[PDB]
Amino acid sequence: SFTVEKGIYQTSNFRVQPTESIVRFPNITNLCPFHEVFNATTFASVYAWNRKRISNCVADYSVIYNFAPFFAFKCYGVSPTKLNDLCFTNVYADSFVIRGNEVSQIAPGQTGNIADYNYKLPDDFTGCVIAWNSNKLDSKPSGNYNYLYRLFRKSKLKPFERDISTEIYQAGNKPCNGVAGPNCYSPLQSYGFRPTYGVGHQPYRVVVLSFELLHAPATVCGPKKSTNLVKNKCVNFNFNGLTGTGVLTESNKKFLPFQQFGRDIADTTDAVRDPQTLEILDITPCSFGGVSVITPGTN
């Protein structure tokens, strides 16, 4: 309105604004060996998938685009473009080769032969899956028989479980005694790969990247410069990917050696440990409040 009557009115709030920014990342100098996972010229079978652990290195995911002729990532917990900012605890890479029409089975909450007897993903998976065609490398005119998959099993598989035992599946009551007779089968069938098959029946190389969320001290993340530490100012801070705004002060809390964060009733982080110098700091929001306006009538 263009006129105001006599009284007191609650208008708005006041808040102190940040001064600068702080970035604190741990001491990491080596580079992650992402090159070895790709172009390995030899991939394991689906029933015995290859697992590699990556830790204590700087990760630059963009160069991954230059190693394999894939089309795009398929990430679930995060976005591919944001992988250069987050900082994790450990990285796992699982590589194998499957058929074309089975790539859809590598996903959380999926059912199928590969999902039940070969490779199972958790329902709360946080990672990415990269699959690309390899018809030129894994096909022969007479047919390749170096890739096998399991078909018969007593029960399904728990997530991230591997089975290597080769026995005789016993459908009937009589014991198999290690012979390929009636009602007794060998639970390993070899993929038939030929270059004349359709696009849905051609070999595909699959690599799954799994990240561990920040609960332990971080070990793998990208090349971000670490600035200096300044206290007693309403400042923007970034501790191992945890971003916030407030005043940082020395803390008297008695952290245990395995504790890295502190929380409150409202589930907000208020205590942090500096990655470089193991010191406990506490965070308090800078000053804020409400403003009221007292005025008589505009007349």
Binding site: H215, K253, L256
Partner: protein
């Protein structure tokens, strides 16, 4: 060879087997958490080994307690068949190091250390990918579990009064190691060290964990000093409901 024998007994666990559920600092609050815990006032088995046919199931987790001083216990073994047809863990501890391997070992019926050859433990190991070596890790309590291919171990050692039975009070456990094993475990075995053999004796307590919801109390210093089991009796259920 078979040269070791074992005897069983039963006793009450009282209120033992509490561990920090996460690496998050809290203080002066009451927190309700659902996890795998040892139930209050439950039978735990007392084993006396004297110089074993261990078919001890792993279930969903194992709580192991030892009140000895001579230091004769060394490591554990986990598996489901314990033959060459399936991989098995070989957690072995000594004075200077701890070694964890999961290979297709062919274990004997009665495995023990000669003291320091493992030929009496297993015969061969052909295929495996995971190996680990680290620094080795009064009543000592340990908790072993596995979830989604992650094998987690908690431990705590505390000075104890001169009493045979388990004490009265609270003592929280702390995590040490989590590893990506990712195999199937149904049975587990315990290894003993026998010098040369000379007769020996040992005793330990074994209990099994279950999925339970607990109400933990944090003091002003951030340590757990009291707990309430919400599935024990109606009074505890009322206390949990009222927080």
């Amino acid at each position: 060879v078979n040269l070791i024998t074992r005897t069983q007994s039963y006793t009450n666990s009282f209120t033992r087997g509490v561990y920090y559920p996460d690496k998050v600092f809290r203080s002066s609050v009451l927190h309700s958490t659902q996890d795998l815990f040892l139930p209050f006032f439950s039978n735990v088995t007392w084993f006396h080994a004297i110089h074993d046919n261990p078919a001890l199931p792993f279930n969903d987790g194992v709580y192991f307690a030892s009140t000895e001083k001579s230091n004769i216990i060394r490591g554990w073994i986990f598996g489901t068949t314990l033959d060459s047809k399936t991989q098995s863990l070989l957690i072995v501890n000594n004075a200077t190091n701890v070694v964890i391997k999961v290979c297709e070992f062919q274990f004997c019926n009665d495995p023990f250390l000669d003291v320091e050859s493992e030929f009496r433990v297993y015969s061969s190991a052909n295929n495996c990918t995971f190996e680990y070596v680290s620094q080795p890790f009064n009543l000592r309590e340990f908790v072993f579990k596995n979830i989604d291919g992650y094998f987690k171990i908690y431990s705590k050692h505390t000075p104890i009064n001169l009493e045979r039975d388990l004490p009265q009070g609270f003592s929280a456990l702390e995590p040490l190691v989590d590893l990506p094993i990712g195999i199937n475990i149904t049975r587990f075995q315990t290894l003993l060290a026998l010098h040369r053999w000379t007769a020996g004796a040992a005793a330990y307590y074994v209990g099994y964990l279950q999925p339970r919801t607990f109400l933990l109390k944090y003091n002003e210093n951030g340590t757990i000093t009291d707990a309430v089991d919400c599935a024990l009796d109606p009074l505890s259920e009322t206390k949990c409901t009222l927080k």
